Amino acid sequence: SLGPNGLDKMMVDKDGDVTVTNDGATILSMMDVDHQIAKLMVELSKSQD
Amino acid sequence: YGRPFLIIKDQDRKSRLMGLEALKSHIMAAKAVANTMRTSLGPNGLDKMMVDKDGDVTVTNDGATILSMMDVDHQIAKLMVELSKSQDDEIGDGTTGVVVLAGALLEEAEQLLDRGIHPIRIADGYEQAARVAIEHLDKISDSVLVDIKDTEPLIQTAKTTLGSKVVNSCHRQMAEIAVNAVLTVADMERRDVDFELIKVEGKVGGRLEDTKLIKGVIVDKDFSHPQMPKKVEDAKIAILTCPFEPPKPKTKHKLDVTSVEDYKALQKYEKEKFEEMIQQIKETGANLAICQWGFDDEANHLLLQNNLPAVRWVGGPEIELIAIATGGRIVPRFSELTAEKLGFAGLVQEISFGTTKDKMLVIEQCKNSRAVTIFIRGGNKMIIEEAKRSLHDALCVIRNLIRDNRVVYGGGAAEISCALAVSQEADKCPTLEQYAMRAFADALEVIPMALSENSGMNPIQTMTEVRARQVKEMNPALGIDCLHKGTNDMKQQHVIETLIGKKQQISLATQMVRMILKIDDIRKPGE
Amino acid sequence: PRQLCDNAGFDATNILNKLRARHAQGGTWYGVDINNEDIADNFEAFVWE
Amino acid sequence: VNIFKAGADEERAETARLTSFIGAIAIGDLVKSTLGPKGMDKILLSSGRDASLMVTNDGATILKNIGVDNPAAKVLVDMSRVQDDEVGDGTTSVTVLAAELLREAESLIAKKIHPQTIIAGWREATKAAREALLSSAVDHGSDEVKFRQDLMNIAGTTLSSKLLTHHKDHFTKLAVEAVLRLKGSGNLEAIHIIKKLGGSLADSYLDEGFLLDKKIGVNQPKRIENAKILIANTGMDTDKIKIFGSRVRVDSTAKVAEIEHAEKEKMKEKVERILKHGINCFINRQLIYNYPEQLFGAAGVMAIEHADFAGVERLALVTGGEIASTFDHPELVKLGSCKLIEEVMIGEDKLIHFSGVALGEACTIVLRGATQQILDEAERSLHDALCVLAQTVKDSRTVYGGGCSEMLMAHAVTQLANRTPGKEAVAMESYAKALRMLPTIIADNAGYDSADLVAQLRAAHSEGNTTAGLDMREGTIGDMAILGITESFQVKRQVLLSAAEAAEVILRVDNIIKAAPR
Amino acid sequence: VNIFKAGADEERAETARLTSFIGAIAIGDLVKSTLGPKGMDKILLSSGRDASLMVTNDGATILKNIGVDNPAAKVLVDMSRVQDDEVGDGTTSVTVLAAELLREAESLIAKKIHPQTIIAGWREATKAAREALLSSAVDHGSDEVKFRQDLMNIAGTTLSSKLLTHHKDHFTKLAVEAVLRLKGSGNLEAIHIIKKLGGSLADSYL
Amino acid sequence: LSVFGDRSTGETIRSQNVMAAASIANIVKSSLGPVGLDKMLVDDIGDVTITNDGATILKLLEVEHPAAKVLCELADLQDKEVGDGTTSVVIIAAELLKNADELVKQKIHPTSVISGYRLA
Amino acid sequence: DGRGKATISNDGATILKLLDVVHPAAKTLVDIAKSQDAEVGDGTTSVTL
Amino acid sequence: GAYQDRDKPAQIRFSNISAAKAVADAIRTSLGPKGMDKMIQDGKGDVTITNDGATILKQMQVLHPAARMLVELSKAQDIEAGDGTTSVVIIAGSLLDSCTKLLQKGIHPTIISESFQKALEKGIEILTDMSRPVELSDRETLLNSATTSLNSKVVSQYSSLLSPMSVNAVMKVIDPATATSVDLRDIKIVKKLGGTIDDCELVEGLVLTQKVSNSGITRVEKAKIGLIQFCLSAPKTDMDNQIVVSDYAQMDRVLREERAYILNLVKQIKKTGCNVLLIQKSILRDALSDLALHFLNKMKIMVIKDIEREDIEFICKTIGTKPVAHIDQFTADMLGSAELAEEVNLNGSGKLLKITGCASPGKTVTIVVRGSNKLVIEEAERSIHDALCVIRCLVKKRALIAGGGAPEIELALRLTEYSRTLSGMESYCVRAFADAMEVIPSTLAENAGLNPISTVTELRNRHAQGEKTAGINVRKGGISNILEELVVQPLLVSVSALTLATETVRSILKIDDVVNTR
């Protein structure tokens, strides 16, 4: 997802909604992680953004 | 009074359909079979691929196989399957369209039932129409009885019947193969031929064009001892069924050696008997031997010691093919073996046909042989099996031609003229059987329609033009330009077919569907 | 005869009535003819059991 | 190591692309059958709704009712929904073109060029195509003759894909007259679309005036001539109260009795204020109590109650009245005037006929036909036609369709492909082929030889015959201007732009990530 | 109306083609990685056999050990088995070429030309191609020098797709000497292949 | 082709309707005439109800088959109009239906039978 | 049958043999079918009627 | 030539056709003078008998969509004609059958639809040609049309009396001059259990299913009728109110004064001279109070509660009495008068209201339906409604056609010769079309127990010079001049049938595939 040549992600909401985006904060926010440090990185990106 | 009672056990689950509803259901099922089959007709047709219960696969066009491998449950589907099986093992291809005739006929029959005609009269009319059709057909028959030694009317016929199978790649060659084989094994004085004399054999590998008839017999064993020479020029052949072992009378038997000298005598006899049989086979003047059963290794060597190559563990049918091909006999002892019974051939040579697999044995016998084999090669096991079935059907059709030496140009012109004759009679029909007549004609009209459909042309423009031509002219030699050649004269196109083929096809279909109409009530037990 | 005519799809009442009337006096072997859809001397028609 | 909760996936850059593209192509080939003047149409059936089903040709509805799980497919569905919001048809076109774009982009991925370069090249080609299209537009301003001619041409074109095709001329006259009645107003709500069974589809028509599906009051006069019309929102049966909710506390039931009386006189004097305008026709969206209508009959004034905001708007537009309240200053409220009001019955129900209207601002089409499905799809088709035709009125430029315009686009793109040199040129040719694929599919569903037709058409266009297009009643090339097979510039422009954006967003994806559904 | 027993299918002319072609293309792209002098190779693992596994580059073995349900794929697998029975490598080539044939034929079906015409045209083109190939052959008879040279060339070529590539010259000498020992006998069983652990692969020898 | 239930036609349903009518007839066939013997109903819970008047029996007897419901309603109407003959009218209806079917069971066109009945 | 083997028949006695009757009284009729089949032939149908 | 790649469309078409044909054959039994009705048991537990097709199909919970379109077709035909619903659906079935034939007959469906359009044009021309113009004033032809429609349902039992019933009712409700499409809802239908269908009666007046509320008054002579809406109870304001009690005389002042208020109400009511009271529902608030009932019974006034709001317009139309919603407006001017009004006693104790004879003859009219079975009563009312519908249809077009399939065989013959004249595959199409029309006479013969094919063929042969007057006769069991057997149906019936069926079959041909939804 990094760089102008980069490629973005598309997320599937719990309720079946979709979202295409490149903003890493959103990428991790919409993610449903379970391993804790994944959550820590998600919160990392949210804070940085 | 009002209360349930048991009449037939499992009374809840013994279902029943009766009368016109049942009939319409049956016609629906038959039409489903017809639709499944339609695409397999014609050189432009497309074949099916089956999945075996055990997970095996098979690609084929032969409708008999199509229905055989099918796992149907509705009964009349089974009846059509058995139909195709019967038609095939009576004739050959045509099953390419027999059930098609059945389905179209039953469809139009339902068209009549919708107008409330009782089925029995429909059956009677259809029988009359069939009789008319066959008599007009064999009036308009050509014949190959007046033909010179029948080299390539037979070749043309094979060319035709192979226009439907994928083996069509070099189908010229396989046509010569089929005709040569059957002509060799035919009993003209009898008008029959037993296909047991024909040895169908396909070994995967190589090209398809490599497939070659062998005026001889091919045996799935190598030499008994690996050191023996691979080629033999002379073919003095011995055919034996007694294994090269000390004889044992199969009544429950065993000796009672007691003494020193007893055992020594037995030990001497052990090798003495091998020497005896070796001397016997040598003095017979034979050069090569074949045994039904296994060898004792010791005799295997001693046989090697005298320049007499041999084959071990040969199955029966193969053995008798050897015998008839070489003109030899089957000898049960060494002692009764003599030179006269010895088999002879031109050339016998093992072939390492497979690049990395075990070998094969071929006998290029050179005199006349009432038996012959076909060796099929190609790139696919499935293509091998398809070639087997196709060539078998070709042999069947040439056999049928031997049974009756009069044929009809194919391409649909035949039944076209049949339908026109039926229509002509329909005017002198009188009552209700008239609808039966025109009904059967229109139903029979299907085969040209299916051919054209698989040809991608507009079917009906083509068939109307065909009718117009075959009416304005008198030639019943105008079908459908299946292979897109500007002449509808299939006689020039050589697209031909045995009278027996179509005749048996239409009569059989008539009887089958007559019964199909004959039924009204069904009681299926719930599974 | 009634079942015969029913499987023949006729008005077996007309057939039956004509049958009884003709068969009171006119001849022993009159009976149902399927194709002519009415009475006939089936004996001469060779329906022999 | 497991990262997500159970029931969550992670498809990266192979399976993600594969699933997305399978979904896109499935959506495309799911709807390809509906496009083309000889196109087909679909049946959609509810899961369980007493089998609520809609025979349909407009692709937008088809994608609306289908439930899709593959996210890319859902993106495409929303795309079509938006495009329908803009022009009505071409939803068909938009989806199919996007689908072929994606399929051919997958073919490029097989050629293994980086997707970013694909995106850049496609952006360039889209820019070139839109420019060439703009160069191909044709205006029609004050030329009322040619204008109206081209207008009915647009109607005939877009209509000839739904079931109404075999009555193209009739509904063409319908839509033309209807939109011309709008006097340039883009508010389609001014056009009511009433549908009721019975009669042939040919029997559907536009009245000279207006129609209302309401019941008259008690025996006020049924028919009225030189009718004066007044419209308001002041509720009657909801007896006018003072919303805060004061009580009434009284010592004796004498007082409650006189209070009832005063209620009645208050209502009556409101009625008298109504009548002081000297108006014989009165309506309101609110339900009206029967005592007021009794007063009205005493005045002999016909009154129609409970015609919703839509009906009120349509009456105001058709009759010019100013929907009102309190009636306090009659001189300051402009009434409504119509030549005649009468009750007509159609099929089974008596309807309120409004002939001889002062203002042609509004109108309403009668839909006679065969099936609630047939009527429903006819309704949808006419709505799409009115949409596109109003858009035509707003922007008086046209484009020659029949694939011709799109093939001009492809030709220009191919020409620019040579000045590209680079990997982008491959995507340029890609875009051109995908574009050309549309009329190919058209003639395909038309059962003609697509391959030769498309090649001949491209030959003509590369020669320069910018007018030559496709004939759908004989399957050959021809002069579109002769046949008038045209469409609004804005339609195709939105088609291209939205499709390009869809391709961009879809290809930019290289990982799908589903959270566990709740 | 139901015709077959339960658990039986009927896919006609759209889904049949679709499934067959998906299987064929899946088989193809499953093995494309193994072909080429810079090609890759696969890992195949038993379901349960104490994890009997075979790192493999020869496509024929790969198709042999894979269990496939789509009938067309199984046809292709048998095809590769036969071809390996004939020449050893190119199983890779045969399968991949067939796969691309089928994919591109699917593209033609999208163009909607009748398959029978496709078959006829392909037959014609195959005939032409085989003829042209025959025109391009080069013999080497008594020219023992050029012969043996080309022989070791063949060894180096075909070998340079398996892991032994980085020792092409060595095993080239091996195979050349081995087959030259056969005195023209095609019985490969005359060549025993004993395998036992230890030492570098370079230490393998005749 | 209707979900959630099959259909029956022709002879089967005709015989079924006659069968139900005969059942209903035999339910009350023993309670008419100066030697009629009354019925009684163990309800489900012991609150029995002895009665010979047919309409009462039919009302207190649950019925599911359609034609039987038709006959029950006829009995109720008759009671609302006469008071007895529920002793009789049900029997009359069932017997007429039986013989009319027996005619139809052969072939006889139903509407002809209906016209004959009207005349009768 | 329950075994899946089809069997068509026009002779009524054969059919009744296939229709394994449980109700007792009808077993007598089916036995009459066997009797007539062993005695004289078609009309076993007629016998039952 | 061109190649057809896909086969899913053809297969789905075939499935739809088979479903339609099966539904047609299921309906096929119930048809014509020899018609046999069906019964449907609801999953709810309801039971219905029916011979009319539309009710049958509405009771059908059809799964396959095609037949749902067929059901909708039947609904439209009924809301147009009333019978021939059977006929139109059976035509639909036969058409789709010939459509199958044409599908394996390889012709593309669109050409089929266009040829069908030509066919229906020829058919409509022929049908218009063959009819007999008939003035509305001739009672006996009306009666013949009635008894033609009637002797196909169960009510043929008392056809002889039911036909004059319907015709007289319609004549009394129409305007015999304007030849408009006089509404059926002006005819009141009453399902009253018990009695005999023979005892069905016309009431040239008004009938209310409600029961009296006065104990003592049953019959009133020279009664003057008045209908009142405002409640008769303690005055309760629209907005919240309450009496406050704080003092001494408040108690008796209240009680005495609501008594006085009710007294004033009733006293004015009498002063108008009325003797029969009508009160509508006021579920929102107090209805007629008991005390007012006491006064009215004391003053000997006929009284009725619970008049449905939907009935008020019908009642005021019939007895000619505008309602009154406030005390003051209630005046002897508006009190309607009727010759007689009272409560009949049927059902043993099921009591009913009749008001026979009115000096102000309302154009409306009512029907009383009698009979034993509930189901037979419902079927009878259905059939009578169908009779009124067919009479209205005859009013719509003063044209008459002899029934008995003769129009249809005429159509078959003329269309067959037309197809012979007209070349192209459309000729094959039209020949199929005529063979499709051939079905109705076949069904008539089948349900008549006659040899169908022989009869149809002989009837065509006769009709070659035996024009539409001749046809299939039931009573003689053969072929005769049906017109002299007096069995005739209006042109509109079969015309609408053909038109609707043709449009539906064209629409069906447009269909190719069905997509399951969410």
Coordinates of C-alpha atoms in Angstrom, one line a residue, chain H residues 269-496:
Chain H
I269 CA -85.1 14.4 15.4
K270 CA -88.8 13.8 15.9
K271 CA -89.7 17.4 15.0
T272 CA -88.3 16.7 11.5
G273 CA -90.8 13.9 11.3
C274 CA -88.4 11.0 10.8
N275 CA -89.2 7.6 12.1
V276 CA -86.2 5.5 10.9
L277 CA -82.7 6.2 12.2
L278 CA -79.4 5.4 10.6
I279 CA -76.1 5.7 12.5
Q280 CA -72.6 5.1 11.1
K281 CA -69.6 3.7 13.0
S282 CA -67.9 6.1 15.3
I283 CA -65.3 3.7 16.7
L284 CA -63.0 6.6 17.4
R285 CA -65.3 7.8 20.1
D286 CA -68.8 7.3 21.7
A287 CA -71.4 5.7 19.5
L288 CA -75.1 6.1 20.1
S289 CA -75.7 6.3 23.8
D290 CA -78.1 3.9 25.5
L291 CA -80.2 6.7 26.9
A292 CA -80.8 8.2 23.5
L293 CA -81.9 4.7 22.4
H294 CA -84.4 4.8 25.3
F295 CA -85.8 8.1 24.1
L296 CA -86.0 6.9 20.5
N297 CA -87.8 3.7 21.4
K298 CA -90.1 5.7 23.6
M299 CA -90.8 8.0 20.7
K300 CA -91.2 4.9 18.4
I301 CA -88.3 5.5 16.0
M302 CA -86.7 2.7 13.9
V303 CA -83.0 2.7 14.7
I304 CA -79.8 1.0 13.4
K305 CA -76.2 1.2 14.6
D306 CA -72.9 0.3 13.0
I307 CA -73.2 1.5 9.4
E308 CA -69.9 1.0 7.6
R309 CA -68.3 4.2 6.1
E310 CA -67.8 2.5 2.8
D311 CA -71.6 1.7 2.6
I312 CA -72.6 5.3 3.1
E313 CA -72.2 6.4 -0.5
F314 CA -74.1 3.4 -1.7
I315 CA -76.9 3.9 0.7
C316 CA -77.3 7.6 -0.1
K317 CA -77.3 6.8 -3.8
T318 CA -79.9 4.1 -3.3
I319 CA -82.5 5.5 -1.0
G320 CA -81.7 9.1 -2.2
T321 CA -80.8 10.7 1.2
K322 CA -77.8 12.9 1.8
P323 CA -76.4 12.4 5.3
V324 CA -76.6 14.9 8.1
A325 CA -73.6 15.6 10.4
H326 CA -74.9 18.3 12.6
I327 CA -78.2 19.0 14.4
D328 CA -79.1 22.1 12.5
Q329 CA -78.7 20.7 9.0
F330 CA -81.1 17.9 10.0
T331 CA -84.3 19.1 8.4
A332 CA -87.4 17.7 6.8
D333 CA -85.9 18.8 3.5
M334 CA -83.3 16.1 3.6
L335 CA -85.2 13.2 5.3
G336 CA -85.6 10.6 2.6
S337 CA -88.7 8.6 2.2
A338 CA -89.3 5.0 1.2
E339 CA -92.5 3.0 0.7
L340 CA -91.6 0.3 3.1
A341 CA -88.8 -0.7 5.4
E342 CA -88.6 -3.5 8.0
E343 CA -86.6 -6.5 9.3
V344 CA -87.4 -9.7 7.5
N345 CA -86.8 -13.0 9.4
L346 CA -85.0 -15.9 7.6
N347 CA -82.4 -18.4 8.7
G348 CA -84.8 -19.4 11.4
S349 CA -83.5 -16.5 13.4
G350 CA -80.9 -14.9 11.1
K351 CA -82.6 -11.6 10.6
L352 CA -82.1 -9.2 7.7
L353 CA -83.1 -5.6 6.7
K354 CA -85.1 -4.7 3.6
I355 CA -86.2 -1.3 2.3
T356 CA -88.5 -1.8 -0.7
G357 CA -90.0 1.0 -2.7
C358 CA -88.4 4.5 -2.8
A359 CA -90.0 7.6 -4.3
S360 CA -86.5 8.8 -5.3
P361 CA -85.3 5.9 -7.5
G362 CA -81.6 5.4 -7.0
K363 CA -79.9 3.9 -10.0
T364 CA -78.2 1.3 -7.8
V365 CA -79.6 -2.1 -6.9
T366 CA -78.9 -5.1 -4.6
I367 CA -79.0 -8.8 -4.8
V368 CA -80.0 -11.4 -2.2
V369 CA -78.3 -14.7 -2.5
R370 CA -79.7 -17.9 -0.9
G371 CA -78.7 -21.5 -0.8
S372 CA -77.8 -24.2 1.6
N373 CA -74.0 -24.7 1.4
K374 CA -71.8 -21.7 2.2
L375 CA -69.5 -22.7 -0.6
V376 CA -72.3 -23.0 -3.2
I377 CA -73.5 -19.6 -2.2
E378 CA -70.0 -18.1 -2.8
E379 CA -69.8 -19.8 -6.1
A380 CA -73.3 -18.6 -7.1
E381 CA -72.4 -15.0 -6.2
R382 CA -69.2 -15.4 -8.3
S383 CA -71.3 -16.6 -11.2
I384 CA -73.8 -13.8 -10.9
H385 CA -71.0 -11.2 -10.8
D386 CA -69.6 -12.8 -13.9
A387 CA -73.0 -12.4 -15.5
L388 CA -73.2 -8.8 -14.7
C389 CA -69.6 -8.4 -16.0
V390 CA -70.5 -10.0 -19.3
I391 CA -73.6 -7.8 -19.7
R392 CA -71.5 -4.8 -19.0
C393 CA -69.1 -6.0 -21.7
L394 CA -72.0 -6.3 -24.1
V395 CA -72.8 -2.7 -23.2
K396 CA -69.2 -1.7 -24.0
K397 CA -69.5 -3.0 -27.6
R398 CA -73.0 -3.6 -29.1
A399 CA -71.7 -6.6 -31.0
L400 CA -72.6 -10.2 -30.6
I401 CA -71.0 -13.5 -31.4
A402 CA -72.4 -17.0 -31.3
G403 CA -70.4 -18.9 -28.8
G404 CA -69.6 -22.6 -28.8
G405 CA -66.1 -22.3 -30.3
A406 CA -67.5 -21.4 -33.7
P407 CA -65.6 -18.1 -33.6
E408 CA -62.4 -20.0 -32.8
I409 CA -62.7 -22.5 -35.6
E410 CA -63.6 -19.6 -38.0
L411 CA -60.4 -18.0 -36.8
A412 CA -58.4 -21.2 -37.4
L413 CA -59.7 -21.6 -40.9
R414 CA -59.2 -18.0 -42.0
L415 CA -55.8 -17.8 -40.4
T416 CA -54.7 -21.0 -42.0
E417 CA -55.6 -19.8 -45.4
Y418 CA -54.0 -16.5 -44.6
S419 CA -50.8 -18.3 -43.7
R420 CA -51.0 -20.2 -46.9
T421 CA -51.2 -16.9 -48.8
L422 CA -48.4 -15.2 -46.9
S423 CA -44.9 -16.6 -47.4
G424 CA -41.9 -16.8 -45.1
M425 CA -41.3 -18.5 -41.8
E426 CA -44.1 -16.3 -40.5
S427 CA -46.3 -18.6 -42.6
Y428 CA -45.2 -21.5 -40.4
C429 CA -45.8 -19.3 -37.4
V430 CA -49.3 -18.4 -38.4
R431 CA -50.1 -22.1 -39.2
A432 CA -49.0 -22.9 -35.7
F433 CA -51.2 -20.0 -34.4
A434 CA -54.3 -21.5 -36.1
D435 CA -53.5 -25.0 -34.8
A436 CA -53.3 -23.3 -31.4
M437 CA -56.8 -21.8 -31.7
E438 CA -58.0 -25.2 -32.7
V439 CA -57.9 -26.3 -29.1
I440 CA -61.1 -24.8 -27.6
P441 CA -63.5 -26.9 -29.8
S442 CA -61.5 -29.9 -29.0
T443 CA -61.9 -29.3 -25.3
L444 CA -65.6 -28.7 -25.8
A445 CA -66.0 -32.0 -27.5
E446 CA -63.9 -33.8 -24.9
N447 CA -65.9 -32.4 -22.0
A448 CA -68.9 -33.3 -24.1
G449 CA -67.8 -36.9 -24.3
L450 CA -67.7 -36.8 -28.1
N451 CA -65.0 -38.0 -30.4
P452 CA -62.9 -34.8 -30.4
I453 CA -60.9 -35.2 -33.6
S454 CA -63.7 -36.4 -35.8
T455 CA -66.0 -33.7 -34.5
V456 CA -63.5 -30.9 -34.9
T457 CA -62.6 -32.0 -38.4
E458 CA -66.2 -32.4 -39.5
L459 CA -67.0 -29.0 -38.0
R460 CA -64.3 -27.4 -40.0
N461 CA -65.5 -29.1 -43.1
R462 CA -69.1 -27.9 -42.4
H463 CA -67.8 -24.4 -41.6
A464 CA -66.1 -24.2 -45.0
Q465 CA -69.5 -23.1 -46.1
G466 CA -71.2 -23.3 -42.7
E467 CA -70.3 -19.9 -41.3
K468 CA -70.1 -19.0 -37.6
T469 CA -73.8 -19.7 -37.0
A470 CA -72.9 -23.3 -37.1
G471 CA -70.9 -24.9 -34.3
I472 CA -70.6 -27.5 -31.6
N473 CA -73.8 -28.2 -29.8
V474 CA -74.0 -29.8 -26.4
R475 CA -77.7 -30.6 -26.0
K476 CA -78.0 -32.5 -29.3
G477 CA -74.5 -33.9 -28.8
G478 CA -73.4 -32.9 -32.3
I479 CA -72.8 -30.0 -34.7
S480 CA -75.6 -27.6 -35.5
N481 CA -76.4 -23.9 -36.0
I482 CA -75.6 -22.6 -32.5
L483 CA -77.2 -19.3 -33.0
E484 CA -80.6 -21.0 -33.3
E485 CA -79.7 -22.8 -30.1
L486 CA -79.4 -19.3 -28.6
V487 CA -75.8 -19.6 -27.2
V488 CA -74.1 -16.3 -27.8
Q489 CA -71.3 -14.3 -26.1
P490 CA -70.2 -10.7 -26.7
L491 CA -67.3 -9.9 -29.0
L492 CA -65.3 -8.2 -26.3
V493 CA -64.9 -11.5 -24.4
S494 CA -62.9 -13.4 -27.0
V495 CA -61.3 -10.3 -28.4
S496 CA -59.8 -9.4 -25.0

